[PDB]
Design brief:
The structure is a homodimer. Chain A is mainly beta. Chain A is built from 6 helices and 22 strands. A 5-stranded mixed beta sheet of chain A has the order 5-4-13-8-9. In chain A, strand 17 and strand 18 form a beta hairpin. Chain A is globular and about 70 Å long. The termini of chain A are far apart. At the A-B interface, strand 17 and strand 18 of A face strand 17 and strand 18 of B. The complex binds ligand MTE (2 copies) and molybdenum atom (2 copies). One copy of the ligand Nc1nc2c(c(=O)[nH]1)N[C@H]1C(S)=C(S)[C@@H](COP(=O)(O)O)O[C@H]1N2 binds next to strand 3 and strand 8 of chain A. Chain B: Its EC number is 1.8.3.1.
Chain lengths: 371, 359
């Protein structure tokens, strides 16, 4: 089934080959603000579709039973191209930290199941208004997405977002056909993927074949029975996915990319660097950094341009240059605060869950200073 | 429970705080910075400074008759709620609130959106604009209480911002802003300006002391000699919060069953999706039952009241802890020291209550 999959950069840390899942090494992760296409993390549940672009058609089911069938050419020409810089973070980012507390079910991601790119495409809003849908519906409606990738029986990958997000101009939801100025790579949804800014990676459906408006959420296995958070007391014999909401917006998150665990850094000065981000378009307003395991803190410098309010879809790269004394031991910890003053919890055990998702307790890195 | 008399500031006893979903008007916590105005209703006018230089001046009668009344159930939480937990770590400056600087009511008024539109402003302005508010209460110098919110929140239909003249079906009490106050749902109590005199649209935030030099969060490392209010944003939306109202600290409860109760709430219209309760100081957890009716997505302005009934052995010690999770899966931090700040605001670490079980 995976014979036709695309070639991938080797540098990427591969945690699953069939289907292909891989993350960039931490030492490359936050070198640039936009993550290069060949190192942007990859999460595939199924074999990668091989799509011929000229015959490709996007099906959008119209409001009274009609159907709109869009070629790539129309998707590009009929709707004004919008570009949005947005970070995708997988729900399982930093899963490994949670697994060490107690084994979980999921891909063993470290801190790199997150990448940033400048996306371009048709606004989902413009496409749905074109198909005949109104700006607002009575009650709770959803927009469902289906991919061209399918399981043995033929069930495709699928997901949904609330209709209000789909139709909001400010939410900047795209039917993306460009990534960092080039056509979408195969691994990243060629020819067309959904990009949902501020929202968990799982809803940004790749190799999009269909868009439908429904009174209910997508019935996909990954919408109904995956990507939810549970109490740490829940285990496999008690988990009941009907008791929790689908992950949409994500909580505030941060990690240290430099230095790396085990490093013996030279004395004098040390530049600690990392990334921080929060869901829902909430900007990172402060990143606190400790060198003594969280007893004392210093304020990092936030690199990057401010985005408009509520539209902070891209991560904040941060740094802190600090003097270091030969022979000393450092425990580097980071924590970020967002625009609603949400914060990261101290520890992992109270936020533990059986699938190892929503891992946002403070990141901790042990290094020493060369004698 | 009064922690200041002149001016007046007070919170309901925890035994009454969460008995009812809507907090009675006589119980609703009160935060006043300045003397309470005695506003004479007939000559009262709300001034709204229009886009061109004009002034829309509205009487209370006009406010009620020209705009369709909108009702919104919303919880107000003060920035200093649970300040006493901050103080326990290191001394802070501020009113010594416990867990009761939070209350809920059904607000009734005109939409701020409709008033601004009525005055000729547009649905959107390019760039970051603000809507500023001034109260009739004033300091010795004569400076009034003031605050602002971003223009986009003020004009959003979904944001439910009101110029309220009713509170739980009765006219606004004096202590709660008679005849009119701003109610900003999902936003810190500070921006809900009471005894409203004026509404203005500006390219900049309100220049008021409480908007510029108060109600911000800082790194725990900041102290009075290094604090710089320019380095942090004004608090608007608040983070996820919870507390235990029953039992009380130091209690000795009878063996058999125990019903733990409390409240949970999050800012920005984010509903509370779960409340985890521990009886062993945070080692193990159980899921509480949430009492409430869901609000539409993004419009959960009111708290969720919760309870858990659990067996308790005779002669044991309990450390009851609660933590809440919101619809964006934001969570509460374990401890206070790492969220400490010099004003003791934004106190949202887990609430811990110790009790013993009788023999
Ligand atoms: N059709 C399709 N879309 C999908 C996937 C999937 O398996 N199939 N995986 C999802 C999840 S879980 C993640 S985290 C993101 C990853 O996007 P990326 O590989 O471009 O980083 O894609 C989402 N889109
Ligand atoms: N005019 C004016 N309004 C104000 C106040 C103020 O002192 N004067 N205090 C503010 C703050 S800090 C709080 S927490 C809330 C409290 O409202 P309440 O007294 O009706 O509970 O009102 C806000 N509105
Ligand atoms: Mo994911
Ligand atoms: Mo307040």
């Amino acid at each position: 089934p995976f014979a036709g999959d695309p070639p991938r950069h080797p540098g990427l840390r591969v945690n699953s080959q069939k289907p292909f899942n891989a993350e960039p090494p931490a030492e490359l992760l936050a070198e640039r603000f936009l993550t290069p296409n060949e190192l942007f993390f990859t999460r595939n549940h199924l074999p990668v579709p091989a799509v011929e672009p000229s015959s490709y058609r996007l099906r959008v089911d119209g409001p009274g039973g009609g159907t709109l069938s869009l070629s790539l050419a129309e998707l590009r020409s009929r709707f004004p191209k919008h570009e949005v810089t947005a970070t995708l973070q997988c729900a399982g980012n930093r899963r490994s930290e949670m697994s060490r507390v107690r084994p979980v079910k999921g891909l063993p991601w470290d801190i790199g199941a997150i990448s940033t790119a400048r996306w371009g495409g048709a606004r989902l809003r413009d496409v749905l208004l074109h198909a005949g849908f109104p700006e607002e519906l009575q009650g709770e409606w959803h927009v469902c997405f289906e991919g061209l990738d399918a399981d043995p029986g033929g069930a495709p990958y699928g997901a949904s977002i609330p209709y209000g997000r789909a139709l909001s101009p400010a939410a900047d939801v795209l039917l993306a056909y460009e990534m960092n100025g080039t056509e979408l790579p195969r691994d990243h949804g060629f020819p067309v993927r959904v990009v949902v800014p501020g929202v968990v990676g799982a809803r940004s459906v790749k190799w999009l074949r269909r868009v439908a408006v429904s009174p209910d959420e997508s019935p996909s296995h990954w919408q109904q029975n995956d990507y939810k958070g549970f109490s740490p007391c829940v285990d496999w014999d008690t988990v009941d996915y009907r008791t929790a909401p689908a992950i949409q917006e994500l909580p505030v998150q941060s990690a240290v990319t430099q230095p790396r665990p085990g490093a013996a850094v030279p004395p004098g000065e040390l530049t600690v660097k990392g990334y921080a981000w929060s869901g829902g378009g909430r900007e990172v307003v402060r990143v606190d950094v400790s060198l003594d395991g969280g007893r004392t803190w210093k304020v990092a410098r936030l690199m990057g341009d401010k985005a408009p309010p509520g539209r902070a879809w891209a991560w904040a790269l941060w740094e802190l240059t600090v003097p270091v004394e030969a022979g000393t031991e450092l425990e580097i910890v980071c924590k970020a605060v967002d625009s609603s003053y949400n914060v990261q919890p101290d520890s992992v055990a109270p936020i533990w869950n059986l699938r190892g998702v929503l891992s946002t307790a403070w990141h901790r890195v042990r290094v020493s200073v060369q004698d």
